[PDB]
C-alpha cells in the first residue's frame, strides 16, 4: 500500500535519527510493531501525524503509542463490563454530561488559567462488545496538566456518583471500578492504533467546552460538527501543541509475532489439559523446536498451576536443541482427545478461513494449488511423499482403525501407488467446505448492502458455483494430487524408514523396546515405519495355557547345567535390527529334535523385515546376494538336510562381522575347517533328545495363538537379557555351550588340539621354544597322530602366530617369537606341577 | 449369524440387529441379544450378502427401492450442482450400481486390474460362470455407462420436465429452465470416450478392495468348476451355483460335478480303474492318494512312485 510505503520511508530514511534507547525519558513516540522508540521534535511529530492520518483513513494496521510524561493532555481509559453484548447507546446527552462532570474535577484541581478558554473532549469507542467487555477513551489533548494533577482528577472521577449513574443507565455493571487509575501514566494509543488484534477505537463524538473565570457558572458544551476536516491523529494527540482545532491551554504545574500465520498453534495450544508436565515440558518444546522463535510460544504455554517460571528453571537455564525428535503433528494428537469438539471447531474454522481467503483473493476461479493447500492443511498428518529411488513420487499413508486394513498394518505407514483415500477425500469431505463457502456467500447476499456490493457478490457466487464442480474432474484431481506432491514432501521419510533398531511393527501396532518394559504403541505416533509383521500380535506377557505349554515343551526337554538359558537368549535379540554381537550359532545335531519346531518358529513368528532362506550355494559356492538378503534384517538361517559336506570359509569372516545367525544342518560335522581370529564367534550346540513329540512340528506352528505366545516370551527373554546381562559377550558362563563349542573346536575345527593339549601353560618354566621348534613339534605330532604329509615351516609359523598362542607371544625388544612362560609335552609326557593346561526349586523362566 | 457378521462393519449394528431379528414369532430375538454380545471374527461376508438375498425372493420391491435410491443419488448430485455432471458423481452412481459385480486391485507393477463377476446371461469362455475374471479394460462397465445409465438420465430429465410444468412463480420456472438446459448439455457427455475413461479411472478408487489379490485362491477348500464354485468345507459337496463372496479367479472347465451318480459312465469308470489289479481286502490306497489333489496345500508330504508295467493303466 502506497501510504504504508510512504510511512516506512519517513520512519527508516528520516526519523531513524531520533531513535531513543530503551527506557529513555526523551521518548515521546513508541512504534510497538517495529519495537522502535523516538524523541520527535514538534516539526517531525506533525510529519508523522500526516502519514499516520493517511494510513488511518485507509484502515492500515498501526500500533503507535505516545508517552504522557510529566506535562501533557488528559486521557481517561474506561474498561466496561456490560449487561449484554450490545454496544451501549452512548448518545450526545450522556457523553455531554460526562464532559461536564470531568470538567468539575479539573476545575476543583485549581490549576486552570484565568480568562476564557476552549477545551475539546473526544470519545473513541471499542468497535464491538466481546463477552460483555466494552471500552471508551476520553481524550482532552489540549488541556496540558501535570501528571500528579491527572492522578488527582482520575481519583476524584472514580468516586463521582453522577458518572456512576450515567454508566449504570448505559448497562455498565462495574461503574465503581471501570476507570483505569493509571490513565495518567500509561502510554496512550495514537488515534487509528491498537493491539494489532484490537480493532482501533473509533471517534464517535467530540465536544467543545468553553470556561470563563469571570463567569464560572456558564460552561457551554457543544458537539464539534466538522471533525472530518481536521487531522484526527494530530488533534487527538495528548503531546501535540501544533493542532489546528486543539490549541493548548497550559495549567499550573509484544504480540508474539503471529504474522497472520502462527495463530493456529496458539489456538490449539491453550485447551490441551497438559497444564501439569512431569516429562511433557521437554516434549512440547522439542515438538515445536522446528520454529526458530519458539521462546514466545514456550512463555505463552507455561503461563497458565502457577510454576513461577517452573521454580525459576527458565527452560533449565535455556536448554538447547538436539537431533530431530517428535514434530508438530503431535500437538493435534495432544488435542482431539482431551477436548475434541473445540479442536474440531477451530480446525474447521481454519479450513474455512484458508478457503475463504483463496476464494476472495481470486474471485471464483479455484485452481490446483489452492485445493492442494487446503488438502495439506487437512491431512498434513496422514500422508507423506518421497522421491525414493527412480525419481517417482511414491506416497505413504498413515492408517487408522476405522479403515480397510490389509491384514495388520494398523498404525504404520503403508506404501500407496495412488492416494486413493485422498482422491475420495477431495470429492466427498472437501465438498462440505464447498457448501460452507457457498452458505457464507449466500448469507452475505441476504444483507442490506448497496447495489454494487450485491453485484460483486452475485458474480463471485456464479463464478464459484461454476468452479465448484471442478473438484470432481479426474484431470483436475490428478493435477491437485500432482500439486500436493510438493506440499506433502518430507525429504527424509524413505531414508529413515526402518533405521530405528529399538522399534518393531506388530499386528497390534508399534512395539517399542527403547525402555526396559515393552511399550506397544497402540495409538497415533510420529515414528516413520513401514515394514510390519502380520502374525506377531503381541499379547503383552501372560500365563495362559498356550504360553504355559510353550514353556513346558520348550525347556526341560533339552539337558542343561544349572538351567542354562543361552539358547533362548541368542534366539532372543532377533528383534534387534542392528548393532549386536557378532556370534553365529551352530545347532547341527539331531534329526527328529525340536530344531524344526523352535528355529522354524522363530522364523515364522517374524515376518518380511527378516526371514532369510539363504541356501548352501549362497554360503559356500566359491555383495551381489551374500548379505543383500540380510540387508536391513535381523535374523538369518540355513536349514539344510541335503548332506553335501562343503567348505567352512570364504564367508564367515564378513557374514558375522543385525545378524543373529543360526546354522542348522545334519548331525555330522559338515563345515569343519576354520582357523583363529574368526573362531570365538561360533557357538555349537547339539540336541541330546529327539518324548519325540511329532505333533508339534506340523499344526501348532501355524496356530496364531502359539505364535502370539512365542512372541510374548521372546519379548520376555529380551527384557531379561537387558535387565540382567546387557550384552552377550559378558554373559554368565555356561559349561555346556562352551564345552560343545570346544568339542567342535577340538573336533578338527582348528589345530586347537595341539594348541592347548601338547602345548602347556607353564609360567614358571623359562624354557625357550622357537617358532621352528614349534613347527617341528607340530610336524611330529601330526605324523605320529593323524597322517603323514610333507610340511612347510613358513606357513606353519604363520598359522601358529595367528592361533590362540598370541597371548604367550610377545614382540619384545629382542624381536622374536620364542616362548618364555610355557612348557611342551613330548611322547609319553604328562603334566608337571606348576604347569597349567591352556537348580532352582521353582520354574526355570524366573530370575536366576 | 450370517446377517450379523455381514453388517458387523456397521459401528452401531445392534440397532439394525434389534430392528430385524425382533420380528411370525421372533419374541425379542428369543431373548438371546446376539447370544449375549458375541465376539467378532475375521473377514467374513459383507453387505453384498444382504444385497444378494433380495432379487429372487422379493425382486419387485427390491428393484423399486434400488431404482429410487439410484434416482435419489443422481437427483442430489444434479441439485447440489446446477446442471453439469462430471466424472466422480457418475463414478459414484456406477459404484452404487454394480458394487457387487466389479472390483479393482493393484497386484504387482502399480497398475489397477479389474475383476468382473459373471452371470449366466453373459458371454463366458467355457466355465467362468460364478467366478471373478480378469479384464484389462472393463468393457461391460463402459457399455453399461453408455446404455444403462441413459435410463437414469432420462428419469432425471423426466423429473425435471415434470417439475417444469407445475404452477409456481416464474423465478422457479427460469431456474428449472436453466437447470434443464445445463443438464441437457451435460447429458451427452456420458457417451464421450474421454469422459468415460475419466469416469473409469475415478471409479477405480471406489471399486477398490485391497484384500483381493493377496486373498484370491489362498482358500484350499474351494474349486473353480464349470458349474461354479465347489466347496469341500462341509461333509457333502456344496456346489455354490449363485452369487458369493468367495474371491477366486482360476477355474476348471471340465469338472462340472453333479454329485456322485450311478449312471453308465461312472459305473464304467469304476469297473475300469480297478478290478483289473488283484487287490487284497479291497486295497484302494493308490487312488486314495490320487484323491486330495483338489486340496491346494498344507497337507501330508507323501510321494507315490508308479514305475511298473509297460502297457498298463500307467
From TrEMBL, chain B:
Family as reported in the entry's similarity comment: Belongs to the asfivirus helicase C962R family.
Indicate which residues the UniProt annotation says bind ADP 2: 272, 311-312, 314
Residues recorded as binding ADP 3, renumbered to this chain, are: 272, 311-312
Gene that this polypeptide is encoded by: C962R CDS
Q: Which residues bind ADP 8?
A: 311-314
Organism in which the protein naturally occurs:
African swine fever virus
**Entire protein: which part is shown?**
322 to 642 of 962
**For ADP 9, which residues are the binding ones?**
312-314
Amino acids binding ADP 6: 272, 312-313
Binding residues for ADP 4: 272, 311-312
Q: What is the protein name for this chain? A: Putative primase C962R
The residues that hold ADP 5 are: 272, 311
Amino acid at each position: 500500500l502506497a501510504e504504508v510505503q510512504a510511512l516506512e520511508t519517513l520512519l527508516t530514511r528520516e526519523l531513524s535519527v531520533f531513535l531513543t534507547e530503551p527506557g529513555s525519558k526523551k521518548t515521546n513516540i513508541i512504534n510497538r510493531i517495529t519495537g522502535k522508540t523516538y524523541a520527535l521534535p514538534s516539526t517531525e511529530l506533525l510529519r508523522l501525524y500526516e502519514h499516520l492520518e493517511q494510513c488511518r483513513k485507509q484502515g492500515a494496521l498501526m500500533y503507535f503509542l505516545e508517552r504522557q510524561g510529566t506535562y501533557s493532555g488528559l486521557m481517561l481509559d474506561y474498561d466496561l463490563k456490560l449487561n449484554t453484548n450490545a454496544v451501549p447507546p452512548l448518545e450526545p446527552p450522556a457523553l455531554s454530561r460526562l464532559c461536564h462532570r470531568i470538567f468539575v474535577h479539573i476545575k476543583n484541581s485549581s490549576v486552570l488559567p484565568e480568562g476564557s478558554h476552549k477545551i475539546h473532549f473526544f470519545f473513541t469507542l471499542k468497535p464491538e462488545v466481546v463477552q460483555g467487555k466494552y471500552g471508551f477513551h476520553v481524550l482532552i489533548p489540549g488541556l496540558k496538566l501535570a501528571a500528579s494533577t491527572k492522578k488527582s482528577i482520575i481519583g476524584s472521577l472514580q468516586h463521582d456518583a453522577t458518572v456512576q449513574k450515567i454508566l449504570h443507565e448505559q448497562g455498565v455493571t462495574n461503574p465503581e471500578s471501570c476507570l483505569d487509575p493509571h490513565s495518567a501514566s500509561v502510554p496512550s494509543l495514537l488515534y487509528g492504533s491498537s493491539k494489532l488484534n484490537h480493532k482501533p477505537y473509533q471517534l464517535k463524538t467530540g465536544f467543545e467546552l468553553v470556561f470563563d473565570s469571570s463567569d464560572p457558572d456558564y460552561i457551554p458544551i457543544h458537539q464539534i460538527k466538522n471533525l472530518e476536516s481536521y487531522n484526527l491523529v494530530s488533534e487527538l494527540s495528548l503531546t501535540n501543541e501544533q493542532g489546528s482545532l486543539v490549541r493548548p491551554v497550559y495549567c499550573a504545574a509484544m504480540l508474539h509475532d503471529p504474522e497472520a500465520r502462527y495463530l493456529h498453534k496458539i489456538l490449539n495450544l491453550l485447551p490441551p489439559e497438559y497444564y501439569v508436565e512431569y516429562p511433557l515440558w521437554s516434549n512440547v518444546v522439542f515438538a515445536l523446536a522446528n520454529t526458530s522463535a519458539n521462546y514466545r510460544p514456550l512463555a505463552e504455554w507455561f503461563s497458565q498451576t502457577g510454576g513461577k517460571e517452573k521454580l525459576e528453571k527458565l527452560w533449565n537455564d535455556a536448554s538447547h536443541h538436539t537431533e530431530k525428535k517428535i514434530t508438530k503433528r503431535s500437538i493435534m494428537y495432544w488435542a482431539h482427545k482431551h477436548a475434541p469438539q473445540q479442536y474440531k471447531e477451530i480446525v474447521e474454522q481454519g479450513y474455512f478461513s484458508i478457503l475463504a481467503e483463496y476464494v476472495y483473493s481470486y474471485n471464483g476461479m479455484l485452481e490446483h494449488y489452492m485445493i492442494a493447500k487446503v488438502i495439506y492443511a487437512m491431512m498434513g498428518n496422514k500422508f507423506v511423499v518421497d522421491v525414493d529411488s527412480n525419481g517417482k513420487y511414491v506416497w505413504f499413508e498413515f492408517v487408522l482403525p476405522g479403515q480397510p486394513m490389509n491384514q495388520g498394518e494398523i498404525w504404520k505407514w503403508r506404501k500407496e501407488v495412488n492416494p486413493d483415500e485422498l482422491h475420495i477425500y477431495i470429492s466427498e469431505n472437501f465438498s462440505r467446505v464447498m457448501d460452507r463457502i457457498t452458505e457464507h456467500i449466500k448469507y452475505h447476499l441476504s444483507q442490506p448492502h448497496e447495489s454494487n456490493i450485491l453485484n460483486y457478490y452475485k458474480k463471485l457466487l456464479k463464478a464459484f458455483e461454476r468452479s465448484k464442480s471442478k473438484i470432481f474432474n479426474d484431470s483436475f484431481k490428478k493435477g491437485v494430487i500432482r500439486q500436493a506432491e510438493f506440499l506433502f514432501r518430507q525429504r527424509s521419510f524413505i531414508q529413515t524408514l526402518d533405521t530405528n533398531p529399538h522399534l518393531l511393527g506388530v499386528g497390534n501396532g508399534v512395539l517399542s523396546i527403547e525402555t526396559i518394559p515393552a511399550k506397544l504403541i497402540n495409538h497415533f505416533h510420529e515414528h516413520p515405519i513401514h515394514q510390519y509383521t502380520h502374525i506377531c500380535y503381541v499379547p503383552f506377557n501372560p500365563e495362559n495355557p498356550w504360553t504355559k505349554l510353550l514353556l513346558n515343551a520348550l525347556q526341560d526337554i533339552i539337558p542343561e547345567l544349572d538351567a542354562r538359558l543361552w539358547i533362548m537368549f541368542y534366539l532372543s535379540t532377533a528383534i534387534f535390527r542392528g548393532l549386536k554381537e557378532a556370534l553365529m550359532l551352530l545347532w547341527l545335531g539331531g534329526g527328529c529334535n525340536g530344531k524344526t519346531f523352535l528355529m522354524r518358529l522363530v522364523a515364522m513368528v517374524l515376518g518380511d523385515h527378516y526371514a532369510s532362506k539363504l541356501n548352501i550355494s549362497l554360503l559356500t559356492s566359491c555383495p551381489n546376494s551374500a548379505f543383500m538378503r540380510l540387508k536391513g534384517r535381523g535374523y538369518g538361517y540355513f536349514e539344510e538336510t541335503n548332506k553335501s559336506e562343503v567348505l567352512n570359509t570364504s564367508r564367515l569372516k564378513e557374514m558375522v562381522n543385525t545378524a543373529t545367525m543360526v546354522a542348522a544342518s545334519n548331525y555330522n560335522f559338515i563345515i569343519d575347517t576354520t582357523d583363529h581370529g574368526t573362531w570365538r564367534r561360533l557357538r555349537h550346540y547339539r540336541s541330546k533328545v529327539k518324548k519325540e513329540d511329532p505333533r508339534f512340528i506340523h499344526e501348532y506352528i501355524m496356530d496364531p495363538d502359539c505364535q502370539n505366545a512365542f512372541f510374548s516370551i521372546l519379548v520376555y527373554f529380551w527384557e531379561k537379557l537387558q535387565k540382567e546381562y546387557n550384552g552377550q559377550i559378558k554373559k554368565v558362563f555356561c559349561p555346556t555351550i562352551e564345552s560343545e563349542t570346544e568339542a567342535y573346536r577340538k573336533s578338527q575345527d582348528t589345530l586347537h588340539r595341539f594348541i592347548t593339549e601338547r602345548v602347556v601353560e607353564s609360567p614358571s618354566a623359562e624354557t625357550v621354544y622357537n617358532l621352528s621348534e614349534v613347527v617341528t613339534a607340530y610336524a611330529e605330532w601330526y605324523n605320529t597322530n593323524i597322517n603323514v604329509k610333507r610340511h612347510i615351516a613358513l606357513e606353519l609359523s604363520q598359522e601358529l602366530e595367528n592361533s590362540v598362542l598370541e597371548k604367550y607371544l610377545q614382540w619384545s625388544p629382542n624381536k622374536t617369537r620364542i616362548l618364555k612362560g610355557c612348557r611342551i609335552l613330548h611322547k609319553f609326557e604328562t603334566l608337571q606341577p606348576g604347569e597349567s593346561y591352556i537348580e532352582p526349586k521353582n520354574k526355570w523362566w524366573e530370575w536366576s
